[PDB]
Amino acid sequence: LGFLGAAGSTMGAASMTLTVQARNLLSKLTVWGIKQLQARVLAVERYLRDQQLLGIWGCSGKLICCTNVPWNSSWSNRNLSEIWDNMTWLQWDKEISNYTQIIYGLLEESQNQQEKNEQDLLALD
Amino acid sequence: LGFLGAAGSTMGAASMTLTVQARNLLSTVWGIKQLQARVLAVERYLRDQQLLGIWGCSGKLICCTNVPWNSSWSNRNLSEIWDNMTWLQWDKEISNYTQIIYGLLEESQNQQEKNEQDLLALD
Amino acid sequence: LGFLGAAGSTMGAASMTLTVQARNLLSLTVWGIKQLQARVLAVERYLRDQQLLGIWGCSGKLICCTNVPWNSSWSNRNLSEIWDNMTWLQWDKEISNYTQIIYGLLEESQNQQEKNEQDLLALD
Amino acid sequence: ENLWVTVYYGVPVWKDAETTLFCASDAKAYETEKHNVWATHACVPTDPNPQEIHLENVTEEFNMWKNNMVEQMHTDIISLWDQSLKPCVKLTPLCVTLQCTNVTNNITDDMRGELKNCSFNMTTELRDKKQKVYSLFYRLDVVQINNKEYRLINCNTSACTQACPKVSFEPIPIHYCAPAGFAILKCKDKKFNGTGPCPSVSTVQCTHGIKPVVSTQLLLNGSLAEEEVMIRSENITNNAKNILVQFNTPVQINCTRPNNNTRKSIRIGPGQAFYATGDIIGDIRQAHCNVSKATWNETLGKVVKQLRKHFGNNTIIRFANSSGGDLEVTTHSFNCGGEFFYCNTSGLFNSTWISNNDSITLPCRIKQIINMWQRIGQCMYAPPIQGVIRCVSNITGLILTRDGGSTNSTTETFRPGGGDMRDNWRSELYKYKVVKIEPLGVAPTRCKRRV
Amino acid sequence: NPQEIHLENVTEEFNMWKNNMVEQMHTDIISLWDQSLKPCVKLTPLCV
Amino acid sequence: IRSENITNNAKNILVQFNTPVQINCTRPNNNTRKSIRIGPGQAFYATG
Amino acid sequence: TLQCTNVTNNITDDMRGELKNCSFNMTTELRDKKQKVYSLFYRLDVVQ
Amino acid sequence: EVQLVESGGGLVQAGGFLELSCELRGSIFNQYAMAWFRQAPGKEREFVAGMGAVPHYGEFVKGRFTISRDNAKSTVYLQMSSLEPEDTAIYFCARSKSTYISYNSNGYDYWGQGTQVT
Amino acid sequence: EVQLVESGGGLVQAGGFLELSCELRGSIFNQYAMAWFRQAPGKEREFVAGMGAVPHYGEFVKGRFTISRDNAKSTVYLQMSSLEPEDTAIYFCARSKSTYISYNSNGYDYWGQGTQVT
Ligand SMILES: *[C@@H]1O[C@H](CO)[C@@H](O[C@@H]2O[C@H](CO)[C@@H](O[C@@H]3O[C@H](CO[C@H]4O[C@H](CO)[C@@H](O)[C@H](O)[C@@H]4O)[C@@H](O)[C@H](O[C@H]4O[C@H](CO)[C@@H](O)[C@H](O)[C@@H]4O)[C@@H]3O)[C@H](O)[C@H]2NC(C)=O)[C@H](O)[C@H]1NC(C)=O
Ligand SMILES: *[C@@H]1O[C@H](CO)[C@@H](O[C@@H]2O[C@H](CO)[C@@H](O[C@@H]3O[C@H](CO)[C@@H](O)[C@H](O[C@H]4O[C@H](CO)[C@@H](O)[C@H](O)[C@@H]4O)[C@@H]3O)[C@H](O)[C@H]2NC(C)=O)[C@H](O)[C@H]1NC(C)=O
Ligand SMILES: *[C@@H]1O[C@H](CO)[C@@H](O[C@@H]2O[C@H](CO)[C@@H](O[C@@H]3O[C@H](CO[C@H]4O[C@H](CO)[C@@H](O)[C@H](O)[C@@H]4O)[C@@H](O)[C@H](O)[C@@H]3O)[C@H](O)[C@H]2NC(C)=O)[C@H](O)[C@H]1NC(C)=O
Ligand SMILES: *[C@@H]1O[C@H](CO)[C@@H](O[C@@H]2O[C@H](CO)[C@@H](O[C@@H]3O[C@H](CO)[C@@H](O)[C@H](O)[C@@H]3O)[C@H](O)[C@H]2NC(C)=O)[C@H](O)[C@H]1NC(C)=O
Ligand SMILES: *[C@@H]1O[C@H](CO)[C@@H](O[C@@H]2O[C@H](CO)[C@@H](O[C@@H]3O[C@H](CO)[C@@H](O)[C@H](O)[C@@H]3O)[C@H](O)[C@H]2NC(C)=O)[C@H](O)[C@H]1NC(C)=O
Ligand SMILES: *[C@@H]1O[C@H](CO)[C@@H](O[C@@H]2O[C@H](CO)[C@@H](O[C@@H]3O[C@H](CO)[C@@H](O)[C@H](O)[C@@H]3O)[C@H](O)[C@H]2NC(C)=O)[C@H](O)[C@H]1NC(C)=O
Ligand SMILES: *[C@@H]1O[C@H](CO)[C@@H](O[C@@H]2O[C@H](CO)[C@@H](O[C@@H]3O[C@H](CO)[C@@H](O)[C@H](O)[C@@H]3O)[C@H](O)[C@H]2NC(C)=O)[C@H](O)[C@H]1NC(C)=O
Ligand SMILES: *[C@@H]1O[C@H](CO)[C@@H](O[C@@H]2O[C@H](CO)[C@@H](O)[C@H](O)[C@H]2NC(C)=O)[C@H](O)[C@H]1NC(C)=O
Ligand SMILES: *[C@@H]1O[C@H](CO)[C@@H](O[C@@H]2O[C@H](CO)[C@@H](O)[C@H](O)[C@H]2NC(C)=O)[C@H](O)[C@H]1NC(C)=O
Ligand SMILES: *[C@@H]1O[C@H](CO)[C@@H](O[C@@H]2O[C@H](CO)[C@@H](O)[C@H](O)[C@H]2NC(C)=O)[C@H](O)[C@H]1NC(C)=O
Ligand SMILES: *[C@@H]1O[C@H](CO)[C@@H](O[C@@H]2O[C@H](CO)[C@@H](O)[C@H](O)[C@H]2NC(C)=O)[C@H](O)[C@H]1NC(C)=O
Ligand SMILES: *[C@@H]1O[C@H](CO)[C@@H](O[C@@H]2O[C@H](CO)[C@@H](O)[C@H](O)[C@H]2NC(C)=O)[C@H](O)[C@H]1NC(C)=O
Ligand SMILES: *[C@@H]1O[C@H](CO)[C@@H](O[C@@H]2O[C@H](CO)[C@@H](O)[C@H](O)[C@H]2NC(C)=O)[C@H](O)[C@H]1NC(C)=O
Ligand SMILES: *[C@@H]1O[C@H](CO)[C@@H](O[C@@H]2O[C@H](CO)[C@@H](O)[C@H](O)[C@H]2NC(C)=O)[C@H](O)[C@H]1NC(C)=O
Ligand SMILES: *[C@@H]1O[C@H](CO)[C@@H](O[C@@H]2O[C@H](CO)[C@@H](O)[C@H](O)[C@H]2NC(C)=O)[C@H](O)[C@H]1NC(C)=O
Ligand SMILES: *[C@@H]1O[C@H](CO)[C@@H](O)[C@H](O)[C@H]1NC(C)=O
Ligand SMILES: *[C@@H]1O[C@H](CO)[C@@H](O)[C@H](O)[C@H]1NC(C)=O
Ligand SMILES: *[C@@H]1O[C@H](CO)[C@@H](O)[C@H](O)[C@H]1NC(C)=O
Ligand SMILES: *[C@@H]1O[C@H](CO)[C@@H](O)[C@H](O)[C@H]1NC(C)=O
Ligand SMILES: *[C@@H]1O[C@H](CO)[C@@H](O)[C@H](O)[C@H]1NC(C)=O
Ligand SMILES: *[C@@H]1O[C@H](CO)[C@@H](O)[C@H](O)[C@H]1NC(C)=O
Ligand SMILES: *[C@@H]1O[C@H](CO)[C@@H](O)[C@H](O)[C@H]1NC(C)=O
16 A cells, blocks of 8 residues: 555545655656656646645644534535445545535635634733 | 725725635746746745745734834824725835844744743753 | 854754755746756755655644654764754764654654544544 | 534545656666667656555546547657657758669569669769769659659658668657656456456556557557457447457567668768668568468467457458558558568458468568658658668557448458557557546544634 | 855865766857857858 | 827827728739749749 | 739739739759749839 | 538539539648548449548549648548549548548548539 | 777788777767777887867878768778788777867777787
């Protein structure tokens, strides 16, 4: 299990080894010259968008990240242990694929709200 | 109010919409003109990201600090800053005495650097 | 006082000025394209180091100590003299062999904390 | 009972994507630099013992016929051939009124009019002087302009380039590797017919070395099947689609050009040199290829058995030679030792199969000016090769076309034809595909962020 | 007035013979001459 | 009426008006194109 | 060099000498063969 | 989207003259060859003429027809001359799968709508 | 790894024809010149011939020999003609340190193993 090896293992099992996936995300003019550079630049852009998207939520380099936004029932409406001891990530991405963007906007709302509350609590004293 | 609509709104009103500008800062005549444009965006993103990192706040988007505010820079009521006046107008007023603040803001985290890794050592 | 100015000084003095080096780690024709390779490389090297820090227990700290115990075999000498008489350049040569195994120790220690925090916040 | 979303980073999920793939080449050829048309000097070295790691319990759907990394491999070879020819001579002053006569140096009855001995005027090092020079040209590269005056075949359309006599057409393996954030999934399933799920799949750093061999009928030197002969086609019932056949055990083909050709230098002008053909030493003989009658017949026996699965147990399978058309599709075209062959495969594909020691000598022809498959326009000129050519190669498959016939015929006739070069590499990239890694999956857990 | 910052109490080893960055200067000057002569006119007609 | 400096006659004046005015331009001749082969892959498009 | 004559086929008065009928040798796809061709040229594009 | 559009529409008598045109839209012209096929009523498709880098003509042509391609307009033009009465058929335009011309219909993947020439 | 490999040599009657060769493997051919040095038994190395962009010959050649370079295979030849009996020696191949040729032995840095020509 060196990279993506936990794809078929359970979401609980796969989530135990995430740093393996994290590390393999940044590693005369000739035809291969441009194709190499276009590869190197593309990797940087995709890596920095995920970090930025995590940053605007309440977790930057946490790699396991809890939030204050509730789990709307309609998204999955199924018991917890089922989706952690009997299902893999690839199947799970299909169930909520339509609902990823709506959750992302909610996470932005809760983080900006959380920041000022932290700011205000440092001013009254 | 989709990218910069709060540009003319009051400073206090503009701080509600901060993530909106954040996510937009990173998203063969034209072959190289497109290539060079993408690298420049990345470098500018990391310059301000690293500049925040050297201070004690990297992924905060609002960050307090241990640096007293010299009255010379502003010498104006706090009420009118956030209730009448805008980030556009403010960046011009502070424009003169701004690079001093960046250096001091590094000192406070340097003063915390003088204090961070000793309390855990003497425990 | 400037970039790498404290290179010849001991570790204790070197750690005083760590931001001076941090700042200077990012800052059609055959001359410009030589710059493009240089400009892409700078971010690539910078991001590799930052990603390595993140998977450890520190993202932008600039000082970061861990709960993995130091194996005496690596150094075998007094703390009071390495920080007052040794420089970083000397230290790298000795610990170079005992490196890339320490990195794995740092990688594992952070993941378990992330799960323990996941576990701790669940039993409330 | 309350539940909140949780964010997980570094999560294993992927999605089919389109991207640019770069080259990786083994360092065994780094020494003795020379130069290649595929320019593997700039190709970054590959990593030894790459991370070929299996993925369990994962089912992934492949489709070799609409696969990516074949269209963009097609462009790479086209562009890789273009920059190789750019710095080389332009034979613009070569086609003028020639004065050719037949070669009669103890020729054989097969090679009667196939060689012409031509003489022409060419500028010396000074632009104020001409001189008469002569060269030997094949019959396929000249036309009459009446008489005994000729011109080169292909300079009333375009002009030809001389492949610098250092570039080496010999193919070498190429590994196509994806960038960080992308992975290549390889199908390990034995009975993989090009489409559908592949229950045995793995992910690799990047593909095995794929030698790009340009060839029509009888694609050579490719990858072999695992335990049976595989017949893969986009749609069997459609006669207009090709049939890519890959058999496990190779059958050896020995192709030679017996003529002991010599190389001569003719000065086009100041700084320009043209590599001509001097007098041929020894005897004249047709070029030919050799395959075993036993090995070829058993291989066709295996192919017919597999063809009955998709066509019927009680069916007559018939083989016939090429339908007829352009020379580069009616014959086995390939490149051997820097020279271009056109072999008549009528002796291989002629048989009928009922449901219930010696070799095959198939003659070949040579050309010097070739219409490149890269474009309908520009050609190129292959300089003569010193000595006697001989190369042994593996036949690893076929490209077939079924003759269209009405129902109730009970006799299916297949013809050979290569045509598109995309099929040459579609036979090698059938295993692979590209996906983009998509971390940041959101799931709920019994945890709340601290306030 | 480039910031030539003196490094004190540190020793460093040098070797000008196996040094790189002269081979890079050699390759630069060759390439810089190559593109300087690309737009220039050739003298092929003068061979008379 | 837009001008960088209306009093400096050396500065051009740009006019932009509301309703466009139509202009119909034609070449009445029925021209025939002739192809002449300059050389290999070279064609000159003359006028017949 | 061009051998040119005025084109006049019941030409309109406004076009007394606007067009020229020019003939000239030209090189074919074979270097050692020449060809005589003609083209029509506007007066503004030819100089006597 | 690859598509082929035909022209000509022959209604000429014996010993006539025509020029069929076929434009290639959704693909590169200098990457594939194009050929003309014919279907007399109650018969099968037959090869008439085609040209990639080299022209080929059918046996019944006997040097009457002539093919050419203008890469500028991405069209292939078929001259028609000495049209005997037996030419009455539907002339189809097809694009080859490669740069080479075959005489069998299995060598082409895109076909024109058709033109009935009588 | 710059390595020099040679050929030629062996007996030939006086007035005969011999050709020597020496190829360059580990470095660019169009960046360095080549030279031929011969060491008679008991004597010191003396310049024979060498070509960069210009051919140079030793004072004893008297126009008999001829040096050329073929960039295609990066080899330098030496067409020996009218070989007198005083030419017998071990002939070395040397790569110059630049594009220019020197008659001295220290203008070159890589040498061949040797080849006896008698
Ligand atoms: C393709 O076509 C070219 C040109 O047509 C041929 O090249 C010529 O071939 C002929 C025939 O072999 C050559 O003629 C031969 O030349 C030999 C060399 O001597 C010549 O040169 C010396 C100076 O070096 C002169 O003094 C001398 O007069 C010759 O001109 C001769 O030795 C040959 O002699 C043969 O014939 C005589 C009878 O005439 C006999 O007595 C001899 O014993 C001997 O058999 C002969 O004359 C000619 O030199 C070639 N070059 C040219 C420019 O013409 C190619 O051979 C041809 N290639 C093929 C494959 O067909
Ligand atoms: C299919 O694969 C087989 C092997 O996997 C391959 O056979 C190879 O063919 C090439 C060319 O025909 C051979 O290379 C030649 O080898 C001979 C010795 O046998 C040498 O003398 C040759 O040297 C000449 O060419 C060089 C390159 O131009 C020159 O530098 C030199 O001076 C000589 O002029 C040449 O290197 C190769 O040895 C075989 N390999 C094997 C294992 O048989 C076959 O060609 C492939 N088929 C196709 C269609 O590509
Ligand atoms: C400029 O000069 C051109 C040269 O003649 C003029 O073209 C002429 O246009 C008329 C009107 O369309 C045509 O008359 C028709 O001809 C068709 C048959 O023509 C077929 O064959 C020609 C051969 O070239 C082909 O080009 C056509 O497309 C057809 O396939 C009849 O069926 C019609 O009933 C009608 O008679 C002329 O044939 C055509 N001339 C030539 C030589 O083609 C053009 O009109 C002139 N323009 C102006 C503005 O004056
Ligand atoms: C716009 O254009 C006007 C011109 O209409 C500019 O005004 C001109 O400014 C020049 C400045 O050198 C004046 O030149 C001066 O002329 C007097 C003689 O009258 C001479 O004694 C001085 O030594 C000097 O050369 C010029 O007279 C003046 N003309 C006018 C009509 O105003 C104006 O500067 C331009 N720019 C702007 C922003 O208006
Ligand atoms: C431009 O000049 C050229 C060359 O002088 C002209 O070409 C020639 O034009 C004549 C008619 O003007 C063509 O017909 C010939 O007429 C003579 C009259 O006696 C007849 O005897 C011939 O049998 C022939 O029919 C002639 O073919 C043509 N030659 C060529 C090579 O095209 C051209 O007409 C002039 N055009 C203009 C617009 O001025
Ligand atoms: C470039 O040159 C080639 C070869 O000369 C041209 O192809 C040849 O074109 C001629 C046309 O004059 C063809 O001749 C024709 O033959 C038929 C009988 O099959 C006859 O009935 C016609 O009247 C005509 O004479 C010839 O078949 C054809 N192919 C060969 C191998 O010669 C080519 O057309 C030239 N390029 C262009 C753009 O025309
Ligand atoms: C390019 O042109 C130059 C100049 O002509 C050529 O150099 C010349 O090469 C010839 C032999 O090919 C030399 O002739 C010999 O000269 C010696 C002198 O002692 C004589 O003894 C021999 O019998 C023979 O005649 C000639 O000297 C030489 N030029 C000079 C000035 O030394 C060169 O070979 C040409 N290169 C090519 C590739 O054609
Ligand atoms: C290099 O050596 C000099 C000489 O010993 C060092 O200077 C000493 O620095 C310490 C630092 O506090 C002082 O306490 C000593 O008094 C200094 N010595 C003298 C003689 O004044 C210097 O620190 C060393 N390192 C560098 C980078 O210069
Ligand atoms: C290649 O294999 C796949 C799967 O093994 C075949 O797909 C199925 O084929 C059967 C019969 O041909 C159909 O009934 C199914 O509906 C197909 N499955 C799907 C998902 O479409 C495919 O037909 C095979 N191709 C060939 C040419 O034999
Ligand atoms: C291909 O096979 C043919 C057999 O017909 C070979 O031709 C024979 O080669 C031998 C070898 O010396 C000769 O003795 C015979 O005279 C040749 N003719 C016949 C009829 O046997 C040919 O050499 C083979 N070529 C290759 C490349 O294998
Ligand atoms: C390929 O070779 C075959 C022979 O095996 C050629 O077919 C022969 O052609 C001649 C020419 O008229 C006929 O007389 C024979 O009867 C044919 N024999 C067979 C078995 O077909 C064929 O022509 C060759 N291919 C080409 C393109 O010339
Ligand atoms: C033709 O195929 C054979 C086997 O299919 C190849 O022989 C194998 O080559 C590989 C790599 O060179 C070796 O690891 C195997 O041990 C070989 N097996 C056998 C049975 O020889 C052969 O290299 C292919 N090419 C040629 C020209 O024969
Ligand atoms: C364009 O408009 C601007 C502002 O409406 C004009 O600028 C002012 O013009 C008045 C009168 O012309 C001057 O008194 C002011 O000093 C100008 N102010 C500035 C800042 O330049 C400008 O003149 C107009 N230009 C034109 C050509 O109409
Ligand atoms: C051909 O065209 C030229 C260019 O217009 C004519 O030259 C002029 O002709 C007019 C009318 O005779 C004279 O008044 C002018 O003096 C001429 N110009 C010159 C510079 O001489 C010429 O006359 C025309 N010839 C014919 C035969 O049409
Ligand atoms: C090409 O142009 C030349 C020069 O104009 C023509 O050659 C001679 O021209 C003069 C004057 O026009 C005539 O008196 C001669 O009779 C021409 N020579 C010949 C051999 O006819 C030549 O005619 C033109 N055409 C070609 C095809 O060369
Ligand atoms: C595949 O599934 C089986 C049964 O659910 C399980 O025992 C096995 O661990 C799974 N594979 C992996 C790699 O976890
Ligand atoms: C979730 O609820 C269903 C309801 O029938 C039950 O069968 C299942 O066992 C539950 N999940 C787990 C993990 O027990
Ligand atoms: C410390 O290093 C020694 C070897 O130098 C090794 O045997 C020992 O296991 C190591 N202990 C730890 C805790 O890393
Ligand atoms: C080859 O041709 C030559 C003519 O140049 C002839 O003398 C010789 O006899 C021929 N070879 C054989 C084997 O007949
Ligand atoms: C030359 O060979 C041709 C074969 O294409 C033949 O027709 C001709 O008669 C032979 N002889 C001459 C003098 O052309
Ligand atoms: C295969 O081709 C036949 C006829 O050409 C057609 O009816 C059938 O739908 C095709 N199959 C697919 C999967 O497109
Ligand atoms: C005018 O000239 C044109 C040129 O082709 C000709 O067709 C026409 O008949 C002429 N008309 C008269 C009235 O001369």
